[PDB]
Structure 1
Amino acid sequence: NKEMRILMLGLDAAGKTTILYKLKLGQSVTTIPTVGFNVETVTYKNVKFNVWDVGGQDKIRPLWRHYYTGTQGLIFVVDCADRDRIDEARQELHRIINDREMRDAIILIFANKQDLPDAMKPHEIQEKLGLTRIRDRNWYVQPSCATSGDGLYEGLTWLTSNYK
Structure 2
Amino acid sequence: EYDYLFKLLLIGDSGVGKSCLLLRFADDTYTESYISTIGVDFKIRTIELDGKTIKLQIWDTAGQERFRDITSSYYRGAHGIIVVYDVTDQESFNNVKQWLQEIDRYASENVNKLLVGNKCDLTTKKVVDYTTAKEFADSLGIPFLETSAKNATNVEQSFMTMAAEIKKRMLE
Q: Say yes or no: TM over 0.5.
A: yes
- 1:7 correspondence with 2:14: no
Residue 141 of structure 1 pairs with residue 164 of structure 2: no
Name the residue aligned to 1:88.
95
TM-score (norm 2): 0.79
Residue aligning to 1:160 = 163
Q: 5+ residue gaps in structure 1? A: none
One-letter code aligned to 1:65: S
Aligned to 1:124: 132
Deviation at 1:43, TM superposition (A): 1.4
Cα drift, residue 71 of structure 1: 1.1
SS at match of 2:157: helix
1:49 partner letter: L
The separation in 2 between residues aligned to 1:56 and 1:88, in whole angstroms, is 16
Give the aligned partner of residue 110 of structure 2: 104
Separation in structure 1 between the aligned mates of residue 151 and residue 77 of structure 2, nearest angstrom: 31
Partner of 1:60: 68
Determine helix, strand or coil for the equivalent of 1:102: coil
Detail structure 1 runs of 4+ shifted over 6 Å in the superposition.
none
| One-letter code aligned to 1:123 | T
How many residue pairs match? The answer is 157
Structure 2 letter corresponding to 1:75? I
TM-score of the superposed pair, with normalisation by structure 1: 0.83
Report the AA paired with residue 88 of structure 1. N
Gaps of 5+ in 2: none
Identity of aligned residues (%): 17
Distance in 1 between residues matched to 2:5 and 2:94, nearest whole Å: 33
Q: Alignment partner of 2:28: what SS?
A: coil
Deviation at 1:154, TM superposition (A): 1.0
